[PDB]
mmCIF file of C-alpha atoms and ligand atoms in Angstrom:
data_model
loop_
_atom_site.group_PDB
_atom_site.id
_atom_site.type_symbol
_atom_site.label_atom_id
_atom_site.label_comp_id
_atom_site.label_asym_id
_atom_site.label_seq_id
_atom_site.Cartn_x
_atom_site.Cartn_y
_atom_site.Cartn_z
ATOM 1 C CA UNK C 3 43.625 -76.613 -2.420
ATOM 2 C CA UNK C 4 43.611 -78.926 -5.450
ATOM 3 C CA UNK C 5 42.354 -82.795 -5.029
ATOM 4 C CA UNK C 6 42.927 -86.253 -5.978
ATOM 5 C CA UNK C 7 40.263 -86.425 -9.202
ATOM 6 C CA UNK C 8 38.334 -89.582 -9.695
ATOM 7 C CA UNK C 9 36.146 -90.056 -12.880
ATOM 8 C CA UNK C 10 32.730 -89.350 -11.274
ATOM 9 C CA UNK C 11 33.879 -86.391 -9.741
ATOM 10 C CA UNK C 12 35.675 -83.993 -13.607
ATOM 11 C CA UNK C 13 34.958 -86.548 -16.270
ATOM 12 C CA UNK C 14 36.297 -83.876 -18.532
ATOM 13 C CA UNK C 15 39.607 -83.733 -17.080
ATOM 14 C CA UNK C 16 40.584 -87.611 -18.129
ATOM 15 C CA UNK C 17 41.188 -89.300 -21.516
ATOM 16 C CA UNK C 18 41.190 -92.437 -22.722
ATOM 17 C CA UNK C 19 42.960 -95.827 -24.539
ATOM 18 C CA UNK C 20 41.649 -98.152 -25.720
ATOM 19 C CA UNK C 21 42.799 -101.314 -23.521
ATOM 20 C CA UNK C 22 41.501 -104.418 -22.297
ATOM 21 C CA UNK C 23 41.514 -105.528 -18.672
ATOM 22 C CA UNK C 24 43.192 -108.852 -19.735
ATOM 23 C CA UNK C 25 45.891 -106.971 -21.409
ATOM 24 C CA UNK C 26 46.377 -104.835 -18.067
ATOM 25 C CA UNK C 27 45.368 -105.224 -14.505
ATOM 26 C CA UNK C 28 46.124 -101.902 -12.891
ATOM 27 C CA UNK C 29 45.939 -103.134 -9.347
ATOM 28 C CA UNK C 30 48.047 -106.096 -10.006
ATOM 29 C CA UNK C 31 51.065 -104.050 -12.123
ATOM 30 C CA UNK C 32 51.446 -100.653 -9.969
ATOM 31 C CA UNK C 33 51.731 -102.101 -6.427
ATOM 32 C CA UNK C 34 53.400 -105.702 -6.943
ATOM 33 C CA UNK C 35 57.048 -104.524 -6.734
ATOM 34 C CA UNK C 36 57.462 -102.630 -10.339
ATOM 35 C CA UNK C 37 57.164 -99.354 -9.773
ATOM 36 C CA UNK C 38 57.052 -98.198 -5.524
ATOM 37 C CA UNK C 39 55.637 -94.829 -6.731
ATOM 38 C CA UNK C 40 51.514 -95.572 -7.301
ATOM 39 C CA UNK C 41 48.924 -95.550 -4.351
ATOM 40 C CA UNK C 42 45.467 -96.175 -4.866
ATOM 41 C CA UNK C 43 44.106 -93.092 -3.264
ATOM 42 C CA UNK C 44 40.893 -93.106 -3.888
ATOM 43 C CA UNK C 45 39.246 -96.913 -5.135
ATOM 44 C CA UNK C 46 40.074 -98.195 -8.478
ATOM 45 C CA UNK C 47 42.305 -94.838 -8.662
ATOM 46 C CA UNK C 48 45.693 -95.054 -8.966
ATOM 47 C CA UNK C 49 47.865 -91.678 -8.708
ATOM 48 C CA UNK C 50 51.557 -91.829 -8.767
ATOM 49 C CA UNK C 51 54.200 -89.402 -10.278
ATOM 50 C CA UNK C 52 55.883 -90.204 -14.188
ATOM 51 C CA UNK C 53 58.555 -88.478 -15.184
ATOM 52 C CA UNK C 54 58.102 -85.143 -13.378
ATOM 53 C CA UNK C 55 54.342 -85.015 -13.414
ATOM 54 C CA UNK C 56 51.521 -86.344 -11.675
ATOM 55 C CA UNK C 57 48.883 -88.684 -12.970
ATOM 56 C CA UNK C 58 45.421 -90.270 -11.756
ATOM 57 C CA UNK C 59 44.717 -93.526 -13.827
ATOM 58 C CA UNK C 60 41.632 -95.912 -14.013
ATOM 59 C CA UNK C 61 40.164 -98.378 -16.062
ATOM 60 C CA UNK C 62 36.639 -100.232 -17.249
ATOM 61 C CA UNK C 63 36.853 -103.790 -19.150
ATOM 62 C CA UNK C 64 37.902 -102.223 -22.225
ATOM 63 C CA UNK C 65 39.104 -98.565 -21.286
ATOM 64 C CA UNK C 66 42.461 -97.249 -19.521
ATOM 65 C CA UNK C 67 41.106 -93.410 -18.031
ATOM 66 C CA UNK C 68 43.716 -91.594 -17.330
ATOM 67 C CA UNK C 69 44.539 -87.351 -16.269
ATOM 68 C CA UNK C 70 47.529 -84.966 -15.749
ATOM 69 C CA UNK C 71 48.058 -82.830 -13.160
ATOM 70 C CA UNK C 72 50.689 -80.591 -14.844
ATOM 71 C CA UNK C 73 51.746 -79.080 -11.341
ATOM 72 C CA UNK C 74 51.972 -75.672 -11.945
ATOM 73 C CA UNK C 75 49.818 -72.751 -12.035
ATOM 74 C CA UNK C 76 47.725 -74.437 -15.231
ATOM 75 C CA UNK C 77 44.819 -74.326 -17.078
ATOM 76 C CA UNK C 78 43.895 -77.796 -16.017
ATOM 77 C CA UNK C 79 43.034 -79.419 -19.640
ATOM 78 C CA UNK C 80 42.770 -83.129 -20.685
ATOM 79 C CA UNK C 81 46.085 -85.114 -21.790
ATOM 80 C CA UNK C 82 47.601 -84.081 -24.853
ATOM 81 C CA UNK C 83 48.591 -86.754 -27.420
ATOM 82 C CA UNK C 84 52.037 -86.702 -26.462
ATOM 83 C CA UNK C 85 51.031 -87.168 -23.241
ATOM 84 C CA UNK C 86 49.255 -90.105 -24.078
ATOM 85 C CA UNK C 87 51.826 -91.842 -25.977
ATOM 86 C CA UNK C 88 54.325 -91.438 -23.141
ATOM 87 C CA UNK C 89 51.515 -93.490 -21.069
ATOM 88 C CA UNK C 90 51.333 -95.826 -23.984
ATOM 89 C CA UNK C 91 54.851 -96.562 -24.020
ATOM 90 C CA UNK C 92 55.380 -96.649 -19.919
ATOM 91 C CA UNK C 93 52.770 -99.721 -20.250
ATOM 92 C CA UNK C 94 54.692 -101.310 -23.393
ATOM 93 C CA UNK C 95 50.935 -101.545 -24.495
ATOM 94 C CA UNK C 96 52.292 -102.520 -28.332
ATOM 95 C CA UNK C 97 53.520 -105.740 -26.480
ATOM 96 C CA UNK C 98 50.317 -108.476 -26.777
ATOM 97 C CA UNK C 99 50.156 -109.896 -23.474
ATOM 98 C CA UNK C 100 47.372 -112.308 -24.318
ATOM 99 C CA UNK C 101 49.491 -113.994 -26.878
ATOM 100 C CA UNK C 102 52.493 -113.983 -24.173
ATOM 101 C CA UNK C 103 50.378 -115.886 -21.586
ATOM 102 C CA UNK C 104 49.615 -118.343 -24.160
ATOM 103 C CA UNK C 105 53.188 -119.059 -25.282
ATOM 104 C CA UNK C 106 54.027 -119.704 -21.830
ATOM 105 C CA UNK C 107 51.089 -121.759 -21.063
ATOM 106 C CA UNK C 108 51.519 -124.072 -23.748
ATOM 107 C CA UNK C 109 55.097 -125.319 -22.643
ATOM 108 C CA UNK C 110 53.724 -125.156 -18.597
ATOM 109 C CA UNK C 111 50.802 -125.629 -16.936
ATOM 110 C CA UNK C 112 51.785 -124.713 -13.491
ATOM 111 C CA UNK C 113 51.771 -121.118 -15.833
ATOM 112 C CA UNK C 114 48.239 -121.979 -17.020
ATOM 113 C CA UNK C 115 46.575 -122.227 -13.769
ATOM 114 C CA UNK C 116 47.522 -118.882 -11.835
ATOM 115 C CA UNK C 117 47.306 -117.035 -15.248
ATOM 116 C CA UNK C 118 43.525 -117.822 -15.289
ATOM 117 C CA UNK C 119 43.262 -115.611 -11.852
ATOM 118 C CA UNK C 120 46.131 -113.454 -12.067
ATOM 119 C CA UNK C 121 45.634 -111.926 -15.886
ATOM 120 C CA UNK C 122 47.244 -108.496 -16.721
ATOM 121 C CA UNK C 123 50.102 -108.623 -15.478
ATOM 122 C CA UNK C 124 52.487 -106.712 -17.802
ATOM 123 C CA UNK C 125 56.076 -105.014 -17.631
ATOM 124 C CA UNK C 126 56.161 -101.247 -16.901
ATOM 125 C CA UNK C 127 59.137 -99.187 -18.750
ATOM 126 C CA UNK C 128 60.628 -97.411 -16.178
ATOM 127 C CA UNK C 129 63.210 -94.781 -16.290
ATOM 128 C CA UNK C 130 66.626 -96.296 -15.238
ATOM 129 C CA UNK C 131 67.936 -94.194 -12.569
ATOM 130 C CA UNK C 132 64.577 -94.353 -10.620
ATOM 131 C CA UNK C 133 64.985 -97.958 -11.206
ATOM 132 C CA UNK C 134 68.272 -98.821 -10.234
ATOM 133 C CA UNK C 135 67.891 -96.744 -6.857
ATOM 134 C CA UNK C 136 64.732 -98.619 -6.230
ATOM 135 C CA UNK C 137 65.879 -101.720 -6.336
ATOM 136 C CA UNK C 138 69.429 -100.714 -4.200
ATOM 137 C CA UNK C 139 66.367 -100.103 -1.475
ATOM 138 C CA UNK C 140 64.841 -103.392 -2.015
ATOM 139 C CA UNK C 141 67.438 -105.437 -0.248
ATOM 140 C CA UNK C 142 66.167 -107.220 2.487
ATOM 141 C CA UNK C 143 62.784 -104.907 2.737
ATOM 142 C CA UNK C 144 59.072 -105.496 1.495
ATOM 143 C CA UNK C 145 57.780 -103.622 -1.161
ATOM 144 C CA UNK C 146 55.900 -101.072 1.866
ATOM 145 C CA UNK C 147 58.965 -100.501 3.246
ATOM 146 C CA UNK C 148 60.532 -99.708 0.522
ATOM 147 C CA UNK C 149 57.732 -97.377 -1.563
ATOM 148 C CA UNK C 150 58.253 -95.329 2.120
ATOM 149 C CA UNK C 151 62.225 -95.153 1.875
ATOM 150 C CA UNK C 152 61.830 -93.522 -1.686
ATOM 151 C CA UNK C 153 58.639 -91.648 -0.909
ATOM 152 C CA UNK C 154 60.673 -89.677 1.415
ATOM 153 C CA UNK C 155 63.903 -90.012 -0.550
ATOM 154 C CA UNK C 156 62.077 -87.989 -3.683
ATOM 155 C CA UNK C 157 60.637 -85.747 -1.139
ATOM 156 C CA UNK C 158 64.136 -84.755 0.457
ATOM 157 C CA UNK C 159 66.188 -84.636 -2.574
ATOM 158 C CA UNK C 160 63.483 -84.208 -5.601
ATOM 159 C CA UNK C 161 61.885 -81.640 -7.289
ATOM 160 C CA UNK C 162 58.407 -80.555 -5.473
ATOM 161 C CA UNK C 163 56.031 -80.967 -8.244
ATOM 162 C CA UNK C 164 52.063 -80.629 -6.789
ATOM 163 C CA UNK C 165 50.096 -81.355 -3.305
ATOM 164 C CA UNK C 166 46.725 -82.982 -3.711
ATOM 165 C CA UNK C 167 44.818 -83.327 -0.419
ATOM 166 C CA UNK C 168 47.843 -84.131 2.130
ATOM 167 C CA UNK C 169 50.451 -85.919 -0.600
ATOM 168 C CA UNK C 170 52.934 -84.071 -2.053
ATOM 169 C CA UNK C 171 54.847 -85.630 -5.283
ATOM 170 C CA UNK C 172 58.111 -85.098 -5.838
ATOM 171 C CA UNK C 173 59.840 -86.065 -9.012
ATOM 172 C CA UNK C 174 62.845 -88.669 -8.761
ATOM 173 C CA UNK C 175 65.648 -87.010 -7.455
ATOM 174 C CA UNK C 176 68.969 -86.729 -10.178
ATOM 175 C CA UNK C 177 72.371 -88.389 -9.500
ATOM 176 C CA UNK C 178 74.281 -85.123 -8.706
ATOM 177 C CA UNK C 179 71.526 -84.631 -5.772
ATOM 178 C CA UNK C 180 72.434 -88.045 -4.261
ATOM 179 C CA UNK C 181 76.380 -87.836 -4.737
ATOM 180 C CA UNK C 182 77.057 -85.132 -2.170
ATOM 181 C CA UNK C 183 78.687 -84.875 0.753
ATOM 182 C CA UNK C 184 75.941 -84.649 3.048
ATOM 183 C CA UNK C 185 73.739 -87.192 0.677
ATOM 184 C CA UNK C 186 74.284 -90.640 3.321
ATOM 185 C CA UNK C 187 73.698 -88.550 6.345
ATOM 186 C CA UNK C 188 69.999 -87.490 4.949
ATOM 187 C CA UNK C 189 69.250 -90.381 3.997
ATOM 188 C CA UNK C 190 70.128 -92.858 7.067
ATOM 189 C CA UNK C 191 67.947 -89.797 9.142
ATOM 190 C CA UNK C 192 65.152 -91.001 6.170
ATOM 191 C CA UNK C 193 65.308 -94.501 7.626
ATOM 192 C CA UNK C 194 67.470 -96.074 4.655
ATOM 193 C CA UNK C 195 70.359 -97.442 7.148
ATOM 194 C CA UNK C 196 72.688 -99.246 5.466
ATOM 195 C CA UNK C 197 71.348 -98.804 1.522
ATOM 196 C CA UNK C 198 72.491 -95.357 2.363
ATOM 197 C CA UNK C 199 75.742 -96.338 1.728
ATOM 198 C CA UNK C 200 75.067 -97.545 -1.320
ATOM 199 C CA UNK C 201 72.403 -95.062 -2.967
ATOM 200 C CA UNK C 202 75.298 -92.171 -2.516
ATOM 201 C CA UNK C 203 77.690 -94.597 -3.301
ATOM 202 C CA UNK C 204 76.130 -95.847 -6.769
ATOM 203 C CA UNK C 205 75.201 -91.734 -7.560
ATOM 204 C CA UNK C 206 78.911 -90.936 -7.057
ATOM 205 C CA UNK C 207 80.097 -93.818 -9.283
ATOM 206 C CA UNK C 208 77.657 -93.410 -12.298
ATOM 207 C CA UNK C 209 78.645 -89.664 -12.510
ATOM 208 C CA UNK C 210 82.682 -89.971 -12.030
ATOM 209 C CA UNK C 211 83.280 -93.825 -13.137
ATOM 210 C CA UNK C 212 80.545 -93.611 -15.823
ATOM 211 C CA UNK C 213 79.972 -90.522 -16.778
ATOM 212 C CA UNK C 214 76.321 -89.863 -15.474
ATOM 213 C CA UNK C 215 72.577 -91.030 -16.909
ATOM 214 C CA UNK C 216 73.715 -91.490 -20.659
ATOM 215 C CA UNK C 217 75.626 -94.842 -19.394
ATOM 216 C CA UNK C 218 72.513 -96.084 -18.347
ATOM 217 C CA UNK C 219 70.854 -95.282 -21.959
ATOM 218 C CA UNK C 220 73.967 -97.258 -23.422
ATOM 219 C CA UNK C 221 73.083 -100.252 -21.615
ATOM 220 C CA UNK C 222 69.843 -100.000 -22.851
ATOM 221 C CA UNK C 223 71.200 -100.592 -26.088
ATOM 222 C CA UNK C 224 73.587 -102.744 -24.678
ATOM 223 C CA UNK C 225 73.131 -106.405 -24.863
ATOM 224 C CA UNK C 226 71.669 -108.076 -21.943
ATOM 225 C CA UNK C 227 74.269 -109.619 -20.044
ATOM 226 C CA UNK C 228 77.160 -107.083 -20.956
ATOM 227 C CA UNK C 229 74.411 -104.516 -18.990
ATOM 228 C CA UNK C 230 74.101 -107.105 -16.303
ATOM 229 C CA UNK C 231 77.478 -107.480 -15.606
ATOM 230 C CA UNK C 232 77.969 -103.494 -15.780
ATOM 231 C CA UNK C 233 74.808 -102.951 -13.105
ATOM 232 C CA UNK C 234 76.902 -105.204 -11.092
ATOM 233 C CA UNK C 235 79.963 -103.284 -10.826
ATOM 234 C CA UNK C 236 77.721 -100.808 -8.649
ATOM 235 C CA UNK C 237 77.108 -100.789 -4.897
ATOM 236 C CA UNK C 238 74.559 -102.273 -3.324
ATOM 237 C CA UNK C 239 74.186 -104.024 -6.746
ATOM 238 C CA UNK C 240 73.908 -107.805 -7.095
ATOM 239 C CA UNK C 241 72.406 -110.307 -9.407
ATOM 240 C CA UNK C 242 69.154 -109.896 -8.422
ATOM 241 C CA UNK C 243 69.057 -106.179 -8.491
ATOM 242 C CA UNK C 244 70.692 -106.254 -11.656
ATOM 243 C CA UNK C 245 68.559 -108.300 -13.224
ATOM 244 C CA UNK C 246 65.035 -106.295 -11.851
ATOM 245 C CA UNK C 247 66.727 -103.233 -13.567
ATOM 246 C CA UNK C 248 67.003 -105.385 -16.546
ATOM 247 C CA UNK C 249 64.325 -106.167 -16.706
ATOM 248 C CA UNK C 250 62.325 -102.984 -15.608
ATOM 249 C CA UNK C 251 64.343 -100.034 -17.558
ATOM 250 C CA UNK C 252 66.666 -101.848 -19.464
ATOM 251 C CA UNK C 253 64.543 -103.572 -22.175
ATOM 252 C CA UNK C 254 65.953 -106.980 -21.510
ATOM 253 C CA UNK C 255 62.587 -109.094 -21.203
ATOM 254 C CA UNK C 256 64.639 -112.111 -20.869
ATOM 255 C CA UNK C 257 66.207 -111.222 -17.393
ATOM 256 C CA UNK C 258 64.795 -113.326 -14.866
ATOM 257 C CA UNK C 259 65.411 -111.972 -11.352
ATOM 258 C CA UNK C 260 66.257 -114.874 -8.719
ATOM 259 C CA UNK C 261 65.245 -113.890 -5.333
ATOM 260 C CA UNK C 262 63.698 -115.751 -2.085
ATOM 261 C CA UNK C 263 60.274 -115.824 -3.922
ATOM 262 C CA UNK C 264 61.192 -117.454 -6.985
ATOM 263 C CA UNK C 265 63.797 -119.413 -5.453
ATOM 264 C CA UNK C 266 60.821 -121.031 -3.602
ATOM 265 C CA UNK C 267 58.243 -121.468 -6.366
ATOM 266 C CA UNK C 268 60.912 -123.088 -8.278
ATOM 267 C CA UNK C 269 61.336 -125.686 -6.128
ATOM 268 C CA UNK C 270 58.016 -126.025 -4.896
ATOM 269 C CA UNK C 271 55.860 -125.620 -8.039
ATOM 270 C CA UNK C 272 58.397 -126.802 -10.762
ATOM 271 C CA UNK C 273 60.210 -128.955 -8.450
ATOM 272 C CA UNK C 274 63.503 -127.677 -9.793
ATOM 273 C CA UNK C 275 66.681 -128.137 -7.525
ATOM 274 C CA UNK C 276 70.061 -126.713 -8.683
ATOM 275 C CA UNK C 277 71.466 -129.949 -10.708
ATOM 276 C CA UNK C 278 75.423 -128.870 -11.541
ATOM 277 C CA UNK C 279 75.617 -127.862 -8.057
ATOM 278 C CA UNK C 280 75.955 -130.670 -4.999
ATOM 279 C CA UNK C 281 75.084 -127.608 -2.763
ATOM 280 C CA UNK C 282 71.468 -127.649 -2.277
ATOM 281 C CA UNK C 283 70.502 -124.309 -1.625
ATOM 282 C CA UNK C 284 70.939 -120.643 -2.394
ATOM 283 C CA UNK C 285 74.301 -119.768 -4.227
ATOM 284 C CA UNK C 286 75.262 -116.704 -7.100
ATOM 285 C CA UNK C 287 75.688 -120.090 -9.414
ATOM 286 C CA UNK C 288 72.819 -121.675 -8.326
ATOM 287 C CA UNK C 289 70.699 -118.824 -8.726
ATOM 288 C CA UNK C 290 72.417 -117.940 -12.685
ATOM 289 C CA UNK C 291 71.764 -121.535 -13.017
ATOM 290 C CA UNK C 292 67.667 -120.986 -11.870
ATOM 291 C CA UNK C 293 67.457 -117.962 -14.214
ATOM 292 C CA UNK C 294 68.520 -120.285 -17.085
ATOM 293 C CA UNK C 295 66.255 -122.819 -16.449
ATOM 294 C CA UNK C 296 63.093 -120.274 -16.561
ATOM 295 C CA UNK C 297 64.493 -118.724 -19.850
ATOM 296 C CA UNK C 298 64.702 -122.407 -21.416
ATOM 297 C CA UNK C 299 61.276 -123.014 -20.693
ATOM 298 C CA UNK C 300 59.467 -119.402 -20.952
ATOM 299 C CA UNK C 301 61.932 -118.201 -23.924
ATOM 300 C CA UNK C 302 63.093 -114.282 -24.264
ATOM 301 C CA UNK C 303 60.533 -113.090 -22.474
ATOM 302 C CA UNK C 304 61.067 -115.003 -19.349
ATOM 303 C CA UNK C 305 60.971 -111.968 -17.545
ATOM 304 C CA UNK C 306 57.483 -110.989 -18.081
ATOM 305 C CA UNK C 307 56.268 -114.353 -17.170
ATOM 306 C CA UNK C 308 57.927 -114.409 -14.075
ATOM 307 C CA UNK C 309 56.508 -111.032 -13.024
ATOM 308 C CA UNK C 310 53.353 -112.791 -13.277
ATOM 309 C CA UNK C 311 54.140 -115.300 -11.002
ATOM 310 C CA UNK C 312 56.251 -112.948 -8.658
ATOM 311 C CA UNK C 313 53.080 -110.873 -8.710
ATOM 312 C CA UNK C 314 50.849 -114.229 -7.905
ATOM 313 C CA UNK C 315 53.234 -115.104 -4.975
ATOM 314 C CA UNK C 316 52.135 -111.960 -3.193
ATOM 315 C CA UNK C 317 48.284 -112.829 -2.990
ATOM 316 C CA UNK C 318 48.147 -115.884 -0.656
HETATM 317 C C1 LIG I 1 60.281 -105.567 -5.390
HETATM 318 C C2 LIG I 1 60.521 -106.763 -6.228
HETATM 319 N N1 LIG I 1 61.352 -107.743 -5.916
HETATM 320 C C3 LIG I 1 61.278 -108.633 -6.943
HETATM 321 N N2 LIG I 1 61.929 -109.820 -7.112
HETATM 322 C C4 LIG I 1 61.602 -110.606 -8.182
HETATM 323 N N3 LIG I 1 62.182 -111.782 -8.286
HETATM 324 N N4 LIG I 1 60.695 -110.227 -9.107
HETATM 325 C C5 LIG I 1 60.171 -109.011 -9.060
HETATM 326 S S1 LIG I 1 59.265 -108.552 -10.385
HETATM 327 C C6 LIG I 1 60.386 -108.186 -7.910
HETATM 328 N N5 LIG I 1 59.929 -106.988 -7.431
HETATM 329 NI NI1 NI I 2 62.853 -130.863 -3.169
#
């Protein structure tokens, strides 16, 4: 009934901001392991759903384009201004990243080559409970994988919000939905298998143990490690998960998430091994002790710069 808009097709429908392509690269920020919930449906159009609605997004050299679909029966207008501050924010578009990539690339040159291809590459703001269950889905996956385990996951247990052409969005489920009884049944039958386990598991503890989303808002606040360690108490939540929800939702743009990837471009473009440990490879110490190193050389935000290279590792 209603379809995916591009900018050709209702140029009246979208709005604008004023933004740089160096400053964001929309096809290297929404589908490089951030956010699982943006699909380039039609080219150089990005639709995905933020915080229960939908939006289309696309951008010149010096323009971010963006519309709503507000879901129900509307009066289809542009975004409103609120609308287009809660885009603003989602992009953390106050945050130079021009002057980032340069504060980087003066203490590493490694840095300074793959920034020249791979510019734009900022840190979205995500919403923390879509976040943390995420990344509990991220364990031993690939970023298609997962976007399909939560894809269906919001589709079970979330809010229907619009269908355009044959996608339906669903907003991100809340905690009660994935706490119940029958929660881990549903969602091994959605293909989950084991992170099942911990998804219900994780739902069920932040409601009873922590007393539900507003603990998550607190550790936004929260300095960076005491919110670490806290994520960890979780299941299905290590280090590494921790640390992406740190980084992602929590504000804390010195978190430096230590996975396979950057376990690898450590060692083989900084030629880093793990020096107070006689074990050579992979270890929870080793890999605290790998996050340290990056925020010694990058600074606080270490996190943003590895995204960059995280995001680098994916393209050949
Ligand atoms: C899906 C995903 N896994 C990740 N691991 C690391 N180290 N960095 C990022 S940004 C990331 N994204
Ligand atoms: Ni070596």
């Amino acid at each position: 009934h209603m379809r995916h808009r591009t900018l050709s097709s209702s140029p009246a429908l979208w709005a604008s901001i004023p933004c740089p392509r160096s400053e964001l690269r929309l096809d290297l920020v929404l589908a490089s392991g951030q956010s699982f919930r943006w699909k380039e449906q039609s080219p150089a159009h990005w639709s995905g759903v933020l915080a229960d609605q939908v939006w289309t997004l696309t951008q010149t050299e010096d323009q971010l384009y963006c519309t709503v679909y507000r879901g129900d029966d509307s009066q289809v207008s542009r975004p409103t201004l609120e609308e287009l501050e809660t885009l603003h924010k989602y992009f953390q578009l106050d945050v130079s990243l021009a002057q980032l990539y340069s504060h980087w690339a003066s203490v590493d040159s490694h840095f300074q080559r793959v920034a020249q291809k791979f510019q734009g590459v900022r840190l979205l703001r995500q919403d923390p409970t879509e976040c943390l269950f995420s990344f509990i889905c991220s364990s031993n996956n690939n970023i298609a994988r997962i976007t399909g385990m939560v894809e269906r996951l919001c589709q079970a247990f979330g809010p229907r919000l619009i269908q355009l052409d044959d996608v339906t969005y669903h907003g991100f489920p809340n905690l009660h939905a994935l706490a119940g009884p029958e929660a881990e049944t549903h969602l091994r039958k959605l293909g989950l298998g084991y992170r099942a386990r911990y998804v219900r598991a994780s739902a069920k503890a932040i409601l009873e143990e922590q007393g539900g989303p507003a603990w998550l808002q607190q550790l936004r606040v929260a300095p960076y490690e005491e919110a670490h360690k806290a994520l960890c108490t979780l299941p299905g939540v290590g280090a590494k998960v921790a640390d992406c929800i740190c980084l992602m939702a929590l504000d804390k743009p010195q978190a430096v998430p230590v996975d396979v990837h950057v376990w690898q471009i450590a060692h083989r473009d900084y030629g880093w091994h793990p020096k107070t440990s006689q074990a050579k490879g992979p270890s929870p110490l080793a890999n605290k002790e790998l996050g340290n190193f990056f925020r010694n050389l990058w600074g606080p935000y270490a996190g943003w710069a590895q995204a960059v290279l995280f995001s680098a590792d994916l393209r050949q």
